[PDB]
Design a protein around this ligand. Structure first.
Ligand SMILES: [Mg+2]
Ligand SMILES: [Mg+2]
Ligand SMILES: [Mg+2]
Ligand SMILES: [Mg+2]
Ligand SMILES: [Mg+2]
Ligand SMILES: [Mg+2]
Ligand SMILES: [Mg+2]
Ligand SMILES: [Mg+2]
Ligand SMILES: [Mg+2]
Ligand SMILES: [Mg+2]
Ligand SMILES: [Mg+2]
Ligand SMILES: [Zn+2]
Lengths: 134, 76, 47, 174, 118, 72
RNA sequence: CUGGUAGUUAUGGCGAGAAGGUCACACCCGUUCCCAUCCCGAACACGGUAGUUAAGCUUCUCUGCGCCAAUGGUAGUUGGGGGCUUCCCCCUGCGAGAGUAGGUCGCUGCCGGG
RNA sequence: UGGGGCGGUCGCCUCCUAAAGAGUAACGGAGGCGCCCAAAGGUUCCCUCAGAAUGGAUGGAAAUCAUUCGCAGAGUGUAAA
RNA sequence: GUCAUGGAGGUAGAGCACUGUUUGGACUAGGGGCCGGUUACCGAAUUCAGAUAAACUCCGAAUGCCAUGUACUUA
């Protein structure tokens, strides 16, 4: 679980994810990467699930980079609670991913392993992805 | 349930006269906290940093050095 | 910290009101203030 | 006093010969000295500072400048306002007369002045002696001295680098 | 220790007195420059930046000095006469960042004793 | 040199007990002795123990003298 | 040529290197006088120039740091119109930020001595 | 008053929401106030902070002193701008 | 109402120059142990590359706003 150690403000706006990615749309460290085609929120539980699946397939070989981090939090209300009387307690952490953002990077493995470890991870995310090379 | 809900009363700061406009002496040209704009020629500063005209003329918003600004009144 | 009044030393009329700390200034404060009746500066002492 | 009779007469030409200076203005000088003791234990006792400042004045010959505290530190039950130590900044004829007794009668009064102590240089060319025993100077009253705190003696010079700073004190006697 | 800079620190002080003292056509500014041996007097208006008068130890004539403290008083006598020649009567005294104790001071009374109003 | 407030101070010539080394200096103690070295500017006399005159880095009564006289 | 004193968004600053001069300006020498040190003639103030261009200062070289700065392209967006609406597309007008070519070791006014 | 009750709030100041003039709501998101100072007010004169490196004695990671770097990384009675 | 000219104002966008959040290298400053390393009992600071922000800003629009005009049209 990727969580910030501390935050200035517990509550936060939700924002919007319209427009192409601000930066990081080119693979820099590794040789292969997942490029998001659509845009949606990505929680830290989905990052961990996609990280283990891609690492395990390599038998702990090569190197793995995570290009996103869940800075933003979100809240919720219990069932049976009317509207109003403040804001809900925080529940989790998300990372708004815009289209074109590179999410993971891979190096140190042959192409066939790289093209396969990425698709196992891509089935754990709610976005439409792509595989790109340097 | 919930704290918060308190807020102050808006103080209506900002520019009160336009560049190139004739103003009578004593008229307020700018209300501010601190000195966002410095007084210039024929312009004083009040107790709470309001800029007022000391004589009749045309308002001119001019530029001091690279990171500063001032307002002056030039008699016609 | 209380509220005090200053009294002229010739007219005897109370012209000014100020404040002072009663624990730090237990004495009776004296100041030289303009007295409207005589139109001259005059020593004023707290009542 | 005699240091003028010993520095200007023969020390001045020696530096130029040994270093090949372009002009005479590059021969290093002695600018100022300070005598900082530090009585931080007096944050609770107001009687220690009276004797130490008086004792330091007789050792030097000028009024000590009672210092204060700059920042508040929690772990030493100390805050702003109370005095912490004092210093004297003498200059002029007293500059060499103080060193006149310091390198002649004060140093031998120590248990062992022969300790080289060549690593005490700031790195820009200033020597800071740290004599802590309050008995070296033969002017302080030994019996009247109640406590024993530590002291600093700082030599600042117009020497750009260490070798000509160390060289000067060698010719002056150190 | 870095050697102190006597003139440069004065410019900081001279800029402080200049925030409230300025020269105009009606009332010019009387500035003073003091060196280790010479004292220079100048009259300036800042509306257009010209010199209206100037006198010092380097003048054409009138060479008579004593302790270079009443020599300034001699300078003040000349600058007051030269300034009043063109009709300048009221001026403001600019210290130049110095104090108002010795040579800079005694220069001022020389102008006041003559036809000049501060 | 603010007047009066500063403590007393006056140059005094010291002499080593081992060699009577004339050493012009300054101090704040009269030492009840005054000489006329360098006539025209008289200096008091204040004796001192081993100093730079005979310092080793730069035995008279007690210590060894009792030790040698006793055991020899 | 030099010493003052101003204007101008550092293209003017910082750093590095060389030269020069007691005609100026400096460093300098001492504290009798005036004045001053929470102490110290260090500074402020006072009387002269034994010595030196080490410094300050004034000139000359740079792109090392910094600063200024286009053209093209892109993001965004007023108005009009369409979709399958976490948002997207088309037409017209405006049009950045970042990056780059390039520029910079200042330019003007008055007075006094040479 | 997302029915009423229970709970919470009721006047003033600062910030975001607030859509680059001003204004702008919610039981929206964060904090303070109901004072204090006879100097912490007026004026004249003067100078410059935090931190770090090194040198040192009580005294260590930090007390005081000395040099260098240092556009404010300090301070501005108290909350924020 | 449009046109021309002049201003005040930090949103969209962007950026990391400050403040928070943050990824991978270099460098492991350190001080007491173990046998100069291990700092495996740590990243404290500096640097390289890459991100993030309603209550961040070295920057910064389109619009809207306040004026001037003797311009053209219009009530
Ligand atoms: Mg006020
Ligand atoms: Mg007020
Ligand atoms: Mg600039
Ligand atoms: Mg363009
Ligand atoms: Mg641009
Ligand atoms: Mg608006
Ligand atoms: Mg507004
Ligand atoms: Mg409350
Ligand atoms: Mg204050
Ligand atoms: Mg316009
Ligand atoms: Mg944005
Ligand atoms: Zn009366």
């Amino acid at each position: 679980m990727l969580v910030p150690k501390r935050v200035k403000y517990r509550r936060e706006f939700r924002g919007n994810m319209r427009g192409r990615a601000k930066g990081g749309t080119e693979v820099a460290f590794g040789e292969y990467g997942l490029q998001a085609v659509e845009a949606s929120w990505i929680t830290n539980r989905q990052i961990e699930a996609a990280r283990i699946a891609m690492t395990r397939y390599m038998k702990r070989g090569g190197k793995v980079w995570i290009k996103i981090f869940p800075h933003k939090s979100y809240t919720s209300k219990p069932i049976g609670v009317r509207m109003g009387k403040g804001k809900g307690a925080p529940e989790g952490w998300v990372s708004p991913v815009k289209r074109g953002k590179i999410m993971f990077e891979i190096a140190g493995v042959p192409e066939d392993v790289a093209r396969e470890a990425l698709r196992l991870a891509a089935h754990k995310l709610p976005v439409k992805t792509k595989i790109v090379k340097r | 349930s919930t704290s918060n809900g308190r807020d102050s009363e808006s103080k209506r700061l900002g520019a009160k006269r336009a560049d190139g406009q004739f103003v009578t002496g004593g008229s307020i040209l700018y209300r501010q906290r601190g000195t966002k704009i410095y007084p210039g020629t024929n312009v004083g500063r009040g107790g709470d940093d309001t800029l007022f005209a000391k004589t009749d003329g045309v308002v001119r918003f001019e530029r001091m050095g690279r990171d500063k600004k001032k307002v002056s009144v030039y008699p016609e | 910290r209380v509220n005090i009044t200053l009294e002229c030393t010739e007219c005897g009329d109370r012209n000014y009101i100020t404040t002072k700390n009663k624990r730090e200034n237990p004495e009776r404060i004296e100041l030289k203030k303009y007295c409207p009746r005589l139109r001259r500066v005059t020593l004023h002492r707290e009542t | 006093n005699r240091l003028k009779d010993q520095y200007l007469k023969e020390i001045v030409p020696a530096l130029m010969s040994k270093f090949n200076y372009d002009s005479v203005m590059e021969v290093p000088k002695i600018d100022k000295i300070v005598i900082n003791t530090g009585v931080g234990d007096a944050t609770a006792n107001a009687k220690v500072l009276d004797s130490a400042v008086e004792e330091l004045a007789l050792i030097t010959g000028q009024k000590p400048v009672i210092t204060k505290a700059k920042n508040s530190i929690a772990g030493f039950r100390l805050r702003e306002g109370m005095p912490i130590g004092a210093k004297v900044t003498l200059r002029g004829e007293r500059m060499y007369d103080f060193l006149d007794k310091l390198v002649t009668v004060s140093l031998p009064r120590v248990r062992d002045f022969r300790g080289v102590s060549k690593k005490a240089f700031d790195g820009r060319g200033n020597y800071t002696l740290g004599v802590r025993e309050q008995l070296i100077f033969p002017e302080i009253d030994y019996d009247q001295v109640s406590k024993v705190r530590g002291m600093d003696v700082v030599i600042v010079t117009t020497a750009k680098s260490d070798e000509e700073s160390h060289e000067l004190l060698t010719q002056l006697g150190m | 220790i870095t050697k102190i800079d006597k003139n440069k620190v004065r410019k900081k002080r001279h800029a402080r007195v200049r925030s409230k003292i300025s020269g105009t056509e009606s009332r010019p500014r009387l500035n003073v420059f003091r060196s280790n041996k010479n004292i220079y007097a100048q009259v300036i208006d800042d509306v257009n930046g010209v010199t209206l008068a100037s006198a010092s130890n380097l003048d054409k004539d009138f060479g008579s000095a004593e302790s270079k403290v009443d020599a300034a008083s001699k300078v003040g006598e000349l600058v007051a006469k030269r300034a009043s020649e063109k009709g300048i009567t009221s001026v403001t005294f600019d210290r130049g960042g110095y104090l108002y104790h010795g040579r800079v001071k005694a220069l001022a009374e020389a102008a006041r004793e003559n036809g000049l109003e501060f | 040199m603010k007047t009066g407030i500063h403590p007393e101070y006056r140059p005094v010539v010291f002499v080593d007990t081992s060699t009577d080394f004339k050493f012009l200096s300054g101090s704040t103690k009269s030492s009840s002795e005054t000489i006329k070295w360098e006539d025209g500017n008289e200096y008091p006399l204040l004796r001192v123990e081993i100093s730079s005159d005979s310092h080793p880095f730069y035995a008279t009564a007690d210590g060894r003298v009792d030790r040698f006289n006793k055991k020899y």
